[PDB]
Design a protein around this ligand. Structure first.
Ligand code: MG
Ligand code: MG
Ligand code: MG
Ligand code: MG
Ligand code: MG
Ligand code: MG
Ligand code: MG
Ligand code: MG
Ligand code: MG
Lengths: 138, 176, 190, 199
RNA sequence: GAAGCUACCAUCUGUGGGAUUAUGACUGAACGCCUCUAAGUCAGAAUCCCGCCCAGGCGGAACGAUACGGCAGCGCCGAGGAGCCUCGGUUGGCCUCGGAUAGCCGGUCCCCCGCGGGGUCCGGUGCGGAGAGCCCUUCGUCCCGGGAAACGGGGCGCGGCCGGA
RNA sequence: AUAGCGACGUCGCUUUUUGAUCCUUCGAUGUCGGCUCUUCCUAUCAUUGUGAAGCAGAAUUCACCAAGCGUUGGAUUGUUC
RNA sequence: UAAGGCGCCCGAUGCCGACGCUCAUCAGACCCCAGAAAAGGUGUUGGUUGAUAUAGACAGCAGGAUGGUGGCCAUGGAAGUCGGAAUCCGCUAAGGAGUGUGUAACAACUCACCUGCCGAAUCAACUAGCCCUGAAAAUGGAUGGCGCUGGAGCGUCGGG
RNA sequence: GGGAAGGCCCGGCGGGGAAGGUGGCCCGGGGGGACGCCUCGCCGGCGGGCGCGACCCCUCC
């Protein structure tokens, strides 16, 4: 079954191309594999864009199929897409990936040191729990 | 013509040189879809030589300039009247496309002609390009996009960038 | 040209229930259960509407070549529903000129033996498909009845025992002998 | 350091080209479960192609002529050989770095097998097209070990299911322990979260 | 005329399956009906492939015995002892479900069958139970303190029990 | 008209007939037949499985998958024929 | 850089290349060049022209499908159905001196045409792309090979 | 083309138009939420049901 459709007013996340990594709102469907979109608030000038480079999110905001950027921005601000996107888990994973990429060598060493303890404690406690479960089974 | 890249629309006006017979020959204007102004002028001379008794040696390009799209943010339906050469005989046709720019629609027309009839740019003679209302559209491939509540999914997304993780332990997912 | 959407819906009666796991459908009713998968069609099946009222088939972005599969899926599902609620009864008759065709049923309707087909010393032995029951019709001189729930299985058995009796090296326009499907109805009528 | 590939779902030539390049580049490659490989085009077409290959033999002495290997592993091996300069020492040394197998042998069943998305059927073929199974093609061309390898694969699958269940149980213990000890491993977690290894 | 060779000039023996071609069909759309075809399915042969049969790979397997009694040569072990010559490449490991893709993955008692398999429900889903990942992480030693551990670490240090074709 | 044929036309295929040419060979590639022996082609005479007849049966036509297996013994002639 | 190329052989697309077309049980794949035509396809994709359809079509399922008259010349027999011209009228919602099957002739069936149910698009005739039929030779065999079908094929194109 | 669009002032404001018709209205159904018909749950209570007839009584999507 399909849950994410392409209609007027859906928010999609651009994966690659000029505006890579930005949200956008679908205004119209030009053709089978091209849509007229704009990110009035995410800094993306109104333009055409292929379907091959956007990934659909589960955010819908209402405006007519050819409304101008004024009304598109009005609907975007009214629905407050930015904070909800920042709060969703998708953006959290993206932001964490960006953090890991940005990490320099000193924080790499610090992360190694912290992970050593984290794994050691977890492994010891897991051994304790496994022994306890075995004793309970016996 | 070599339909290189995306075409551009040029307004080209030309006239015969003044002669003792007539001081001021009438100026003739034409719309040329071309990669650049040089080939635009060449096509203008070709068409005007077919139409009138005019040649480049006995004429002059009074003006030649690109005409920009009037509304490049409104998706429009374009009807194109076209004249092309097959392997046996020549035919007139009318085709509709859907795009934001007249030049983009004409480029789509050239690519579609090459794909469907193996006709080449030196065979296609473009005649008329008009904005056509959705009620006046008559090709179903364009008409099916005329509704307020358009809605369709992307069913089978094929994995691109197949080579960046050239060896990956997942079998990729095609349902998003 | 690829159509944006082609859909068709099927209404199911109250006495039968339908459960689908992806593209395989299971139909359960008074006469039993029928299962059929459709992983070779690649369209969308939805059991929309509480009270299991309807089953909808969707196809997005399909040319005319695969747009035909929607109605064939719906027809297959309707046939499964019909065979589950009512069942399928294929009645066939044996036509002969001189030699009577002696048909005897064994394995409680699973094997059919045919003898004396045009003075034949050879004995035809045809096995029914699983879930198809053969019988000799009462109140009729010579006629076979095939009972089943799967229309494909019943009709395949009928075709098997029809093609088992064909004249060889003779004018088939004159030697009109063999068992032929007289009619295709249901076990019980509406 | 050896690249272990799984054949199931991969296309013959598409996988063979990548394997040949990797082998030429010096890497040791072992491809496993070759009978799961599939080829585009319908089964009758592919069987006809293999029969046409079978028909090619030296007229005067077939014993010296082309050798038509029937096992799927050897079929894949030969089509890889077709993409290497096997007449030279470099090509032969490369070809010696490749190992093919039907099923999954004991040296490799207890290992993680890699996957090549650039040669996968689900990626390279639209669903409406027809494909053929190399295992079935080989079996009805004259491979004699389709059933034995099937039973052995069934045994391997039923053992791997037990191993995977044990892995699931052990990890679930791991997660329960993690949420149990979050109290005293919290100060070790915010650093990973700030550097984006745990969010 | 022995023996031996030897003759349709004597006598004996000569095989079974599978996918399918042509063709005939089932269900069934496209195209309200129809249709062997488009998706799916069936029967099908001196053909094809294999079996039976002949050979047996710079291809493997199991098993037996493995060099005196004056010398001796050998096999296994002593985490057995120093070395000498020669051939090189390498410069951290990942010890594993099956598989789908017009769908998947993980928990669950709230139920049903034989710990496993189903049902409901709850979570994730551009895969944070991720290979775009995980694990180990090495300058060394000496004092005192805090955090984790007291069940842990190390032992051809041990004797057994299972685990594998 | 089209079971089976097919006029007046017109489009092809083959190199098992003959031509046309003269590229190789004249410090030589032994130049007709028959005998013997193997393999290959299909444009299928028979046999296996089929479809169509102006196919009642018998016989016989036309067509399809198809070269697996067979295709003889003699008079006359150096003959191929 | 030219010409030519960039899946592997084999240097170069390991571009998140663009738009389409095409399934071949003989696919196709680059000047010279190394193999094919006339004629066809309800395979599929475009295009041209003309029709009829809420005064309710196209299917499909059902009812009618009449008198003069078995029209005239005819043949042994021709009632419509082998033959020669014409083809009228009243009844009609409609019926042709007849579209076909059938008998020696009838008979009978059936069609043109009109009605009932069903309720929105449906018919043709051409034309051009790819694919398919046409398409048969001898040692086993050659888009250079492997192989390729979200193309590594065909057409138009872009960066590198 | 002294850039073509575009952005911001509800820019104000002049009139006009249909449609890929927003509300509104009419018809139809998929519904539900008040759950108004049974069944359990604790004669009064709330929660359990993953309850069960509704029907223009509305009433929302
Ligand atoms: Mg006969
Ligand atoms: Mg068989
Ligand atoms: Mg068939
Ligand atoms: Mg079969
Ligand atoms: Mg070193
Ligand atoms: Mg010689
Ligand atoms: Mg000599
Ligand atoms: Mg032949
Ligand atoms: Mg090259």
């Amino acid at each position: 079954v399909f849950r994410r459709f392409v209609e007027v007013g859906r928010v999609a996340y651009v994966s690659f191309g000029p505006h890579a990594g930005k949200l956008v709102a679908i205004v119209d469907v030009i053709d089978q594999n091209r849509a007229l979109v704009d990110g009035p608030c995410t800094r993306v000038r109104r333009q055409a864009m292929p379907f091959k480079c956007m990934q659909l999110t589960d955010f819908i905001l209402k405006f007519p199929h050819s409304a101008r950027q004024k009304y598109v921005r009005k609907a975007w601000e009214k629905a407050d897409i930015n904070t909800k996107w920042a709060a969703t888990r998708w953006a959290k994973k993206i932001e964490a990936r960006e953090r890991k990429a940005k990490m320099t060598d000193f924080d790499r060493y610090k992360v190694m040191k912290a992970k050593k303890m984290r794994n050691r404690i977890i492994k010891n406690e897991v051994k304790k729990l496994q022994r306890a479960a075995l004793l309970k089974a016996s | 013509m070599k339909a290189s890249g995306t075409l551009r629309e040029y307004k080209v006006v030309g006239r015969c040189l003044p002669t003792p017979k007539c001081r001021t020959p009438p100026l003739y204007r034409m719309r040329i879809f071309a990669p650049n102004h040089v080939v635009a002028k060449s096509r203008f001379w070709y068409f005007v030589s077919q139409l009138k008794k005019m040649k480049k040696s006995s004429g002059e390009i009074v003006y030649c300039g690109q005409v920009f799209e009037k509304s490049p943010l409104r998706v429009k339906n374009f009807g194109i009247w076209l004249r092309y050469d097959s392997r046996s005989g020549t035919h007139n046709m009318y085709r509709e496309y859907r795009d934001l720019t007249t030049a983009g629609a004409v480029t789509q027309c050239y690519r579609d002609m090459g794909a469907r009839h193996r006709a080449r740019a030196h065979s296609i003679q473009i005649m008329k390009v008009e904005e056509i209302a959705a009620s006046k559209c008559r090709r179903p491939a364009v008409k099916q996009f005329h509704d307020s509540k358009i809605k369709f999914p992307l069913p089978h997304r094929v994995l691109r960038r197949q080579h960046k993780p050239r060896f990956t332990t997942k079998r990729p997912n095609t349902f998003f | 040209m690829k159509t944006i959407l082609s859909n068709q819906t099927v209404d199911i009666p109250e006495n039968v229930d339908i459960s689908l796991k992806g593209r395989t459908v299971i139909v359960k009713g008074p006469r039993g259960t029928l299962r059929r998968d459709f992983n070779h069609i690649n369209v969308e099946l939805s059991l929309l509407g509480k009270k299991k009222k309807r089953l909808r088939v969707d196809k997005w972005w399909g040319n005319r070549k695969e747009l035909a599969t929607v109605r064939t899926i719906c027809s297959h599902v309707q046939n499964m529903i019909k065979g589950v609620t009512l069942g399928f009864r294929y009645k066939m008759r044996s036509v002969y000129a001189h030699f009577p065709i002696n048909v005897v049923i064994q394995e409680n309707g699973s094997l059919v033996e045919i003898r004396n087909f045009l003075g034949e010393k050879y004995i035809r032995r045809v096995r029914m498909r699983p879930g198809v029951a053969c019988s000799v019709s009462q109140a009729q001189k010579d006629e076979l009845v095939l009972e089943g729930n799967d229309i494909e299985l019943v009709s395949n058995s009928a075709a098997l025992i029809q093609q088992a009796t064909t004249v060889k090296n003779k004018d088939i326009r004159k030697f009109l002998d063999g068992i032929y499907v007289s009619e295709k109805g249901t076990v019980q009528q509406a | 350091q050896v690249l272990v590939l799984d054949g199931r779902g991969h296309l013959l030539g598409r996988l063979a080209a990548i394997v040949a390049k990797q082998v030429l580049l010096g890497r040791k490659v072992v491809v496993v479960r070759c009978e799961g490989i599939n080829i585009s085009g319908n089964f009758y077409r592919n069987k006809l192609k293999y029969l046409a290959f079978l028909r090619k033999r030296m007229n005067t002495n077939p014993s010296r002529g082309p050798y038509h290997f029937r096992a799927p592993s050897r079929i894949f091996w030969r089509t890889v050989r077709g993409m290497l300069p096997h007449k030279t020492k470099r090509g032969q040394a490369a070809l010696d770095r490749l190992k093919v197998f039907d099923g999954i042998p004991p040296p490799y069943d207890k290992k993680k097998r890699m996957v090549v998305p650039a040669a996968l059927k689900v990626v390279r073929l639209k669903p409406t097209r027809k494909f053929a199974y190399l295992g079935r093609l080989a079996h009805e061309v004259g491979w004699k070990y389709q059933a034995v390898t099937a039973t052995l694969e069934e045994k391997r699958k039923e053992k791997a299911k037990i191993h995977y269940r044990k892995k699931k149980q052990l990890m679930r213990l791991r997660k329960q322990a993690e949420k149990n000890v979050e109290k005293k491993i919290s100060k070790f977690t915010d650093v990973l979260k700030t550097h984006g290894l745990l969010v």
